[PDB]
Scaffold this active site. Structure first.
Site, short mmCIF file in Angstrom:
data_model
loop_
_atom_site.label_atom_id
_atom_site.label_comp_id
_atom_site.label_asym_id
_atom_site.label_seq_id
_atom_site.Cartn_x
_atom_site.Cartn_y
_atom_site.Cartn_z
N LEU A 239 0.81 -1.23 0.00
CA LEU A 239 0.00 0.00 0.00
C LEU A 239 0.84 1.27 0.00
O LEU A 239 0.30 2.37 -0.07
CB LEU A 239 -0.98 0.01 1.19
CG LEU A 239 -2.22 -0.87 1.00
CD1 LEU A 239 -2.81 -1.17 2.37
CD2 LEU A 239 -3.22 -0.25 0.04
N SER B 68 -2.59 -2.71 11.78
CA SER B 68 -3.85 -2.66 12.49
C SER B 68 -3.73 -2.68 14.02
O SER B 68 -4.77 -2.62 14.72
CB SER B 68 -4.74 -3.82 12.04
OG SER B 68 -4.32 -5.08 12.59
N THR C 2 -13.37 2.13 11.55
CA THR C 2 -13.20 1.50 12.83
C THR C 2 -13.77 2.29 13.97
O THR C 2 -13.77 3.52 13.96
CB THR C 2 -11.70 1.24 13.11
OG1 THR C 2 -11.52 0.79 14.45
CG2 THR C 2 -10.83 2.47 12.89
N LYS D 154 -6.44 6.30 10.53
CA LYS D 154 -7.73 5.82 10.10
C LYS D 154 -8.75 6.94 9.89
O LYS D 154 -9.61 6.84 9.00
CB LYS D 154 -8.28 4.75 11.06
CG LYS D 154 -7.58 3.40 10.93
CD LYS D 154 -7.92 2.72 9.59
CE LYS D 154 -7.40 1.29 9.52
NZ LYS D 154 -8.00 0.55 8.36
N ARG E 129 -7.62 -14.52 14.68
CA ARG E 129 -7.22 -13.22 15.21
C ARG E 129 -5.73 -13.20 15.50
O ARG E 129 -5.17 -14.19 16.00
CB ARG E 129 -7.98 -12.94 16.50
CG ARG E 129 -7.76 -11.60 17.18
CD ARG E 129 -8.07 -10.44 16.26
NE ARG E 129 -8.70 -9.29 16.91
CZ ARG E 129 -8.62 -8.03 16.50
NH1 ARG E 129 -7.84 -7.67 15.49
NH2 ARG E 129 -9.32 -7.09 17.13
N1 LIG Z 1 -10.31 -6.52 13.78
C1 LIG Z 1 -11.00 -5.44 14.17
O1 LIG Z 1 -11.58 -5.48 15.23
C2 LIG Z 1 -11.14 -4.22 13.30
C3 LIG Z 1 -12.18 -3.27 13.51
C4 LIG Z 1 -12.29 -2.18 12.66
C5 LIG Z 1 -11.36 -2.02 11.64
N2 LIG Z 1 -10.33 -2.89 11.51
C6 LIG Z 1 -9.46 -2.70 10.39
O2 LIG Z 1 -10.03 -3.65 9.48
C7 LIG Z 1 -9.00 -4.23 8.68
C8 LIG Z 1 -8.90 -5.75 8.85
O3 LIG Z 1 -8.59 -6.09 10.20
P1 LIG Z 1 -7.83 -7.45 10.54
O4 LIG Z 1 -8.07 -7.74 11.98
O5 LIG Z 1 -8.06 -8.49 9.49
O6 LIG Z 1 -6.30 -6.94 10.38
P2 LIG Z 1 -4.99 -7.85 10.33
O7 LIG Z 1 -5.33 -9.28 10.63
O8 LIG Z 1 -3.93 -7.10 11.06
O9 LIG Z 1 -4.64 -7.80 8.78
C9 LIG Z 1 -4.00 -6.69 8.18
C10 LIG Z 1 -3.74 -7.00 6.71
O10 LIG Z 1 -3.19 -5.83 6.09
C11 LIG Z 1 -2.00 -6.24 5.42
N3 LIG Z 1 -1.01 -5.18 5.30
C12 LIG Z 1 -0.33 -4.61 6.33
N4 LIG Z 1 0.53 -3.65 5.91
C13 LIG Z 1 0.39 -3.61 4.58
C14 LIG Z 1 1.03 -2.82 3.53
N5 LIG Z 1 1.96 -1.92 3.93
N6 LIG Z 1 0.65 -3.06 2.23
C15 LIG Z 1 -0.30 -3.99 1.90
N7 LIG Z 1 -0.94 -4.76 2.83
C16 LIG Z 1 -0.62 -4.61 4.16
C17 LIG Z 1 -1.46 -7.41 6.26
O11 LIG Z 1 -0.44 -8.17 5.60
P3 LIG Z 1 0.58 -9.11 6.47
O12 LIG Z 1 -0.25 -10.36 6.72
O13 LIG Z 1 1.80 -9.24 5.54
O14 LIG Z 1 1.02 -8.28 7.67
C18 LIG Z 1 -2.75 -8.15 6.47
O15 LIG Z 1 -3.14 -8.85 5.29
C19 LIG Z 1 -7.72 -3.51 9.11
O16 LIG Z 1 -7.47 -2.43 8.23
C20 LIG Z 1 -7.98 -3.02 10.51
O17 LIG Z 1 -7.20 -1.89 10.85
C21 LIG Z 1 -10.23 -4.00 12.28
N1 LIG Z 2 -3.29 -6.21 22.87
C1 LIG Z 2 -3.41 -6.10 24.21
N2 LIG Z 2 -4.37 -5.32 24.72
C2 LIG Z 2 -4.45 -5.39 26.06
C3 LIG Z 2 -3.68 -6.13 26.92
N3 LIG Z 2 -4.15 -6.03 28.21
C4 LIG Z 2 -5.19 -5.24 28.12
N4 LIG Z 2 -5.42 -4.79 26.84
C5 LIG Z 2 -6.51 -3.87 26.44
O1 LIG Z 2 -7.46 -4.58 25.67
C6 LIG Z 2 -8.17 -3.61 24.85
C7 LIG Z 2 -8.31 -4.13 23.45
O2 LIG Z 2 -7.00 -4.15 22.86
P1 LIG Z 2 -6.72 -4.98 21.54
O3 LIG Z 2 -7.33 -6.32 21.58
O4 LIG Z 2 -5.27 -4.86 21.26
O5 LIG Z 2 -7.52 -4.19 20.41
P2 LIG Z 2 -7.75 -2.61 20.19
O6 LIG Z 2 -9.11 -2.31 20.71
O7 LIG Z 2 -6.58 -1.83 20.66
O8 LIG Z 2 -7.77 -2.58 18.53
C8 LIG Z 2 -8.41 -3.52 17.77
O9 LIG Z 2 -9.77 -3.12 17.62
C9 LIG Z 2 -9.94 -1.82 17.04
C10 LIG Z 2 -11.43 -1.52 17.08
O10 LIG Z 2 -11.74 -0.43 17.95
C11 LIG Z 2 -9.39 -1.96 15.63
F1 LIG Z 2 -9.58 -0.77 14.94
C12 LIG Z 2 -7.89 -2.24 15.70
O11 LIG Z 2 -7.41 -2.37 14.38
C13 LIG Z 2 -7.69 -3.56 16.43
O12 LIG Z 2 -8.18 -4.65 15.66
C14 LIG Z 2 -7.41 -2.27 24.97
O13 LIG Z 2 -8.12 -1.31 25.76
C15 LIG Z 2 -6.06 -2.70 25.56
O14 LIG Z 2 -5.40 -1.71 26.33
C16 LIG Z 2 -2.62 -6.92 26.37
O15 LIG Z 2 -1.80 -7.59 27.00
N5 LIG Z 2 -2.56 -6.84 24.98
#
Ligand SMILES: NC(=O)c1ccc[n+]([C@@H]2O[C@H](COP(=O)([O-])OP(=O)(O)OC[C@H]3O[C@@H](n4cnc5c(N)ncnc54)[C@H](OP(=O)(O)O)[C@@H]3O)[C@@H](O)[C@H]2O)c1
Ligand SMILES: Nc1nc2c(ncn2[C@@H]2O[C@H](COP(=O)(O)OP(=O)(O)O[C@H]3O[C@H](CO)[C@@H](F)[C@H](O)[C@@H]3O)[C@@H](O)[C@H]2O)c(=O)[nH]1
Ligand SMILES: NC(=O)c1ccc[n+]([C@@H]2O[C@H](COP(=O)([O-])OP(=O)(O)OC[C@H]3O[C@@H](n4cnc5c(N)ncnc54)[C@H](OP(=O)(O)O)[C@@H]3O)[C@@H](O)[C@H]2O)c1
Ligand SMILES: NC(=O)c1ccc[n+]([C@@H]2O[C@H](COP(=O)([O-])OP(=O)(O)OC[C@H]3O[C@@H](n4cnc5c(N)ncnc54)[C@H](OP(=O)(O)O)[C@@H]3O)[C@@H](O)[C@H]2O)c1
Ligand SMILES: NC(=O)c1ccc[n+]([C@@H]2O[C@H](COP(=O)([O-])OP(=O)(O)OC[C@H]3O[C@@H](n4cnc5c(N)ncnc54)[C@H](OP(=O)(O)O)[C@@H]3O)[C@@H](O)[C@H]2O)c1
Ligand SMILES: Nc1nc2c(ncn2[C@@H]2O[C@H](COP(=O)(O)OP(=O)(O)O[C@H]3O[C@H](CO)[C@@H](F)[C@H](O)[C@@H]3O)[C@@H](O)[C@H]2O)c(=O)[nH]1
Ligand SMILES: Nc1nc2c(ncn2[C@@H]2O[C@H](COP(=O)(O)OP(=O)(O)O[C@H]3O[C@H](CO)[C@@H](F)[C@H](O)[C@@H]3O)[C@@H](O)[C@H]2O)c(=O)[nH]1
Ligand SMILES: Nc1nc2c(ncn2[C@@H]2O[C@H](COP(=O)(O)OP(=O)(O)O[C@H]3O[C@H](CO)[C@@H](F)[C@H](O)[C@@H]3O)[C@@H](O)[C@H]2O)c(=O)[nH]1
Lengths: 341, 342, 341, 341
Positions: C56, C81, C124, C152, C183
């Site tokens: 990207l 992410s 997000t 974002k 995840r």
């Molecule tokens: N999971 C959530 O709760 C949540 C909620 C709202 C929005 N989002 C957003 O929704 C999207 C999907 O989430 P997810 O949990 O599936 O994320 P993820 O598992 O971290 O996947 C991120 C993807 O983006 C790719 N990527 C990273 N850097 C890149 C670059 N420089 N160029 C091209 N591709 C790249 C990664 O490739 P690699 O595998 O090589 O690293 C991977 O395929 C993300 O954009 C995230 O920020 C997530």
């Molecule tokens: N990762 C992580 N988080 C921890 C830990 N102990 C507590 N936490 C708390 O859990 C919570 C959740 O943390 P988390 O699971 O790391 O996710 P976070 O909410 O930071 O982000 C994820 O969700 C977002 C949606 O609002 C996405 F946009 C983003 O891309 C990603 O997928 C936080 O408040 C963090 O401080 C810990 O040991 N690791």
């Protein structure tokens, strides 16, 4: 259909090339940078010419412009072109001069123009740096001595790779130093001609330079832009050295410039204590300051353009003495009409 | 004791006024200047207490070097691709300079261990309000950007907020509404009008073209507004502030008032791209409309409420719209008379 | 003609979305990053699917790929992410998550596909950050609390601007936290499910967490990718919150995860001295370490997806308790079959 | 005080170098990329080792890390290292492999470590490209043949410039192809050893290759990382070719690999119709596909490491036949224990 796209159109070379191509009935397009000030001084008299805002670090603008214009000829003259400044702007210089060249080549390919575009790259004698042969010709190995030189070396080779990989008509003009009345004020030749002009008009008494012993092959930008065009008229895409073959020192440039305002410079002292004194008046007009030196100097350049003479029938018309005369004369006129620069 | 300012964008309108203002207070002033193939320091050449450094907001290493060397007590990030229309064709460059560049500077402060000694001013903007969600707009009005410039500036606004909240950096967003001067860039609407009107007055030009005549703006004077930037860094607490006049005028009114200063009354006829402005006294057309000057997503209306700044900073604008128009036309008449090619 | 381009195809969401679209008979294209290691574990079982190397941050690769594939639907899921990592990778995060979104949009425009592409942006709940309303819905003002959130936010607005300026069918899915057995291991839910699984199998005794009191609205990635598709089936391009509306703490996630392996966690101590002890054995399994805290925490998220329920007829199928069960069960199986997994 | 910073620590070389330095009692720091998947497979057995999230395109992260760690030795092994992929990722490759090298050097300077750091650059035989001498040694002129080669050439020269300009102890290891059981799966040697192992275990019947006639000088990564360390132990910063001096074809690598599983390959047909058949069974195991060819191939490499032998007392321990044996044997064990490995 003759349509040129010039990056770096606002610079010395770009401004002369634009005139040269317009005289031949080309449609000329230029990429200009956004600036908070007026920045088209060298080409304002020309507005067949269309200007487009862009930057060599913005991939999308380059594709848009190339896709819209569909040029038959591209001259990549755009660059952070100052060597001393490249030591403090190493990364920006790499992104513009090195990666920017790739961006333009890739935009040609992306736009489906690989088989129709002829591409000129502004390569340079700085590539020879710490010279491995004297004189330097197309087969002399490169040895860059600045972030500018290193970035230009990337550009040279990525151009070669597009020619070899995709049969793009793409060429490196390996041009030696070329100057003019439009030369940037912080290059040594124009710094001297402006300062000498100011001394002549009583607007300045003395100025400081760096390495007086550096030696350069100096020609005239107006002659050299013609060689760029000739390289794109060639049936085969080939790389060419363009140069005068004649070498002079910075010291000689100073001496000859002052003679044109009726002053004979005699030097005294050595290294950073060396000064240039007018023989006729006894007044000091030139000093040396270490801050103008480069960490890794390029001591000597002398080009052998035999290949261009044979294949392109190109010959330099302006020799060093006339170059010095034209520059001092032009800056006297400029500074007389307007004391502020 | 020690007052050392670093100004990015020192060569621009605001930078040049801010540099004068800080120099008058005895500051040591450092500026970041771009390399250019031409002379580009026209607004500050009369000032060389001032030191200039080559740099660019897209070169992270130059910024750390400069900040580490200068060790400023105050940083004013005014450097930007600031033109909204141009941002539609230079979207990515605009993002990298105006958005990411702001982060680079903040991160350099942190990297250099200056988080607790630097006060940081960000050049935020009324363009953040874009399609305005409240009238008038104040610090709590939700943002709605309408250009790649606006979007980039929004990133910058929030990353500044995050450094303040995360690391206790004294960092502030000045949400400044449109401000102009005789040093305003020539392709902004106000200066385009004042220059063109000046040229018409001196017989160097007959007619010029504009875009959307109905856009409405809150216009103040850059010289007044740079003072507000300094005041925001003198505050005990790092707070964000709207700076504006509260008074709204159209582009059309700017044209009308500018011409009245050279003894001409503009009367409009026609609609949209066929609308023309005619001098009533002579019958001559001086203004036309060209669609190429329109923006794909216009910002129709801005009006700032600077109540918070009035209360906390005691800041008030000194130059109102009518005097701004007069100063700009008068200055460009003098400029174009002395030099027809300026 | 149904041709999808998925950036971030190797990630959690990308892998589920790819399956979902393949089942509908789409031709699915993905952009994959070059890696020195195997990095397609989530999608290897699927190779109708074509993978293309890209990034990207590389404008040319994106134009080439879009111009070759000519997709009818683009899902921009590619991102750095992770929120905690964004504090140490602020600039890279900005370039990928913010500017990368612009590059993709501009490539659509450059390729002449502005009137034929439907574009989904992965927005997000992190945009709400320090929440200005509870619950949060489409009209709640944003307040980002990380370099990730700020990047974002740029992406959200540049998407809006392309829709408004050029009539691109472009939409922001404002998705709340969603999880799965796929995840990423360093997100909190999967960190817990993996660590609990390891404790159950005798491969680990204790693990450390950060802020146990953070509260989140957690759903299942498999349900949420369906909403992404529905948003592109809509007649009008609209932005939508997607969420469960149900809130739980990190602490509850820990408690429920351990109950699934027959252990009842009881907490003792406060802040960084708080520990989680198994009641049945007396053994400590959870501690707190300040290094896992974020400089600017997002304390509470709760989404109101009324708009999506009304217009898209979307409803989450998996609730929190089943999500916890599925994740712990899957990681027990994973760690049993392969202790280094 | 012995503190190493390794960029590219997760790669082949990085993983061997980390082991080698740890055995010497170094404190070892590595820069690791954020990934959506597990990406530390080659070094997970080692956690004296500390990992830091970073990227070679993020200047700020690099300065932070170097300023915090204050290494005595930096090994810049991080790169987009695949030549075929570089043709589709030209710009990203330039930014990582070329400009990334400059970023690291500039961070050294910025952090005031110019006189205390010893810097190793991962230069390469790909610099010789279309070879100008056979064998190739330190003084052979470079001629790159890919965007990877061109980017590495920039890196080579910017390293030289920092050494010459600022007296930084900085060196270019000009390493020829080196392989191992940890080699990336899409390099030809590991592609062959994995595919042969899979055929032996009944997990695959047939695989396709590109240019079977390409010739390379192949050594073992474990031997070559030792040379990197020796170059930083030198009293003077010097550049060195590291190689075996022995040349073999891709075809021979295929033949020797199959021999190790009891199969003799006999070829039939020409160019893209050429197939490799097991003589003992009559079954086809190898085909050719034009998609694996490069636009500008590097036909032949052979290194002369006389200078390293004399000054460093370095000699390769593993020869080509043992390398083939080790790789096939290791991948048989790997694929037997885990069919998805
Ligand atoms: N999971 C959530 O709760 C949540 C909620 C709202 C929005 N989002 C957003 O929704 C999207 C999907 O989430 P997810 O949990 O599936 O994320 P993820 O598992 O971290 O996947 C991120 C993807 O983006 C790719 N990527 C990273 N850097 C890149 C670059 N420089 N160029 C091209 N591709 C790249 C990664 O490739 P690699 O595998 O090589 O690293 C991977 O395929 C993300 O954009 C995230 O920020 C997530
Ligand atoms: N990762 C992580 N988080 C921890 C830990 N102990 C507590 N936490 C708390 O859990 C919570 C959740 O943390 P988390 O699971 O790391 O996710 P976070 O909410 O930071 O982000 C994820 O969700 C977002 C949606 O609002 C996405 F946009 C983003 O891309 C990603 O997928 C936080 O408040 C963090 O401080 C810990 O040991 N690791
Ligand atoms: N003159 C010589 O002796 C000589 C010899 C060999 C090679 N060269 C090279 O030949 C070319 C022409 O030389 P010159 O003397 O005409 O140089 P110059 O006067 O310094 O002109 C540089 C031009 O490139 C533009 N430029 C700079 N950065 C840019 C960016 N990021 N994107 C787009 N454009 C950018 C400049 O624009 P601004 O006006 O906006 O600054 C200007 O138009 C340069 O590439 C130079 O390095 C020069
Ligand atoms: N005037 C207003 O009404 C207003 C209102 C709110 C906010 N703003 C913002 O406030 C600031 C000052 O505005 P202004 O009217 O003074 O703008 P301006 O006259 O256009 O000045 C822009 C300045 O930024 C510099 N700059 C541009 N790109 C750069 C880069 N890549 N690296 C380093 N410096 C760079 C320019 O250098 P060059 O001279 O070399 O081009 C110039 O010094 C800007 O951030 C603008 O966006 C303005
Ligand atoms: N092997 C050879 O025959 C040979 C010969 C001469 C020179 N070289 C060069 O020697 C070095 C070591 O080779 P190798 O075989 O160990 O390469 P490799 O296995 O492909 O390892 C490359 C390393 O660089 C990392 N990397 C890639 N892009 C990065 C970025 N943008 N920021 C930070 N790290 C990044 C990779 O991370 P991920 O794991 O996340 O992808 C990986 O750790 C490379 O520089 C290569 O170009 C190799
Ligand atoms: N600019 C400058 N150079 C000075 C000064 N005193 C001595 N010098 C010496 O003059 C010599 C000429 O310096 P210069 O006029 O600054 O040009 P330089 O050779 O460094 O670069 C020019 O020519 C290159 C061709 O080889 C182009 F590639 C490049 O883009 C540009 O057009 C140097 O050795 C310098 O060290 C002085 O005060 N300023
Ligand atoms: N530049 C320009 N604008 C024109 C023209 N004809 C009509 N207009 C309209 O006038 C209005 C004013 O345009 P403008 O003077 O170009 O300024 P704009 O408001 O777009 O941006 C300026 O002010 C912002 C503050 O809100 C700053 F953040 C920004 O950096 C910059 O300083 C617009 O509605 C435009 O569409 C015309 O010919 N040129
Ligand atoms: N990767 C690959 N190469 C194939 C294939 N069939 C034939 N080949 C040929 O094998 C040869 C070897 O390809 P390769 O194994 O991809 O290695 P290559 O020589 O291109 O690059 C490696 O060594 C360089 C040193 O010269 C390093 F700088 C670089 O970082 C990397 O480690 C080529 O001629 C290729 O065309 C094939 O199917 N895949």
């Amino acid at each position: 259909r003759n349509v040129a796209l010039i990056t770096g159109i606002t610079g010395q070379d770009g401004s002369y090339l634009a005139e040269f191509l317009l005289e031949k009935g080309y449609e000329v397009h230029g990429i200009v940078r956004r600036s908070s000030s007026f920045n088209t001084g060298r080409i304002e008299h020309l507005y067949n010419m269309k200007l487009h805002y862009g930057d060599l670090t913005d991939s999308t603008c380059l594709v848009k412009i190339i896709n819209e214009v569909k040029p038959t000829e591209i001259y990549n003259l755009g660059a952070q072109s100052h060597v001393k400044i490249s030591f403090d702007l190493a990364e920006y210089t790499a992104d513009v001069d090195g990666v920017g060249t790739l961006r333009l080549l890739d935009a040609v390919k992306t736009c489906g123009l690989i088989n129709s575009v002829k591409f000129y790259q502004a390569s340079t004698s700085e590539l020879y740096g710490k010279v491995q042969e004297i004189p330097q010709k197309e087969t002399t190995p490169f040895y860059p001595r600045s972030p500018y030189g290193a970035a230009k070396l990337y550009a040279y080779w990525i151009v070669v790779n597009f020619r070899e990989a995709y049969n793009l008509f793409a060429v490196n003009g390996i041009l030696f130093n070329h100057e003019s009345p439009r030369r940037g004020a912080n290059f040594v030749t124009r710094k001297i001609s402006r300062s000498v002009a100011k001394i002549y008009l009583g607007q300045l008494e003395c100025f400081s330079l760096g390495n007086l012993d550096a030696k350069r092959d100096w020609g005239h930008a107006k002659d050299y832009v013609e060689a760029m065009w000739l390289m794109l008229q060639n049936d085969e895409p080939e790389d060419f050295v363009i140069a005068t073959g004649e070498v002079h020192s910075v010291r000689e440039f100073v001496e000859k410039s002052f003679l044109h305002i009726g002053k004979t410079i005699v030097w005294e002292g050595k290294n950073e204590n060396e000064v240039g004194r007018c023989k006729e008046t006894g007044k000091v007009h030139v000093t040396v300051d270490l801050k103008y030196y480069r960490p890794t100097e390029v001591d000597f350049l002398q080009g052998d353009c035999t290949k261009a003479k044979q294949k392109l029938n190109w010959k330099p018309r302006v020799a060093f003495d006339e170059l010095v005369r034209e520059m001092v004369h032009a800056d006297v006129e400029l500074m007389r009409t307007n004391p502020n620069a």
